[PDB]
Structures are given as structure tokens and as C-alpha cells.
Design a protein around this ligand. Structure first.
Ligand code: ZN
Length: 46
């Protein structure tokens, strides 16, 4: 167990890369992908 916590969640699409909320996925996708680009990444799994 840990100190009292909460569980945010207003929209069905919430980005975890930065922390943004979108109405539809189409937007969440076109956004998330953006994050990735000119930067060193590691082994992708999914
Ligand atoms: Zn983001």
C-alpha cells in the first residue's frame, strides 16, 4: 500500500508522453506520433 492517491481521467484519450487530453483518437494519434522524431530512442515494444 501507498499514501492516499487519486486517479485522474476526464477524456477517453489522454496522452502520457506530455499530459494532454483530446476528444477523439485521431487527434491523440496525430499528436503522440509528433513527440517522436529528432531524438535518440530505445527498443520499442508493443
Ligand atoms: Zn503528448
Amino acid at each position: 500500500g501507498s499514501s492516499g492517491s487519486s486517479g485522474t481521467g476526464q477524456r477517453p484519450y489522454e496522452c502520457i508522453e506530455c499530459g494532454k487530453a483530446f476528444k477523439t483518437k485521431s487527434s491523440l494519434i496525430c499528436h503522440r506520433r509528433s513527440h517522436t522524431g529528432e531524438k535518440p530512442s530505445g527498443p520499442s515494444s508493443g
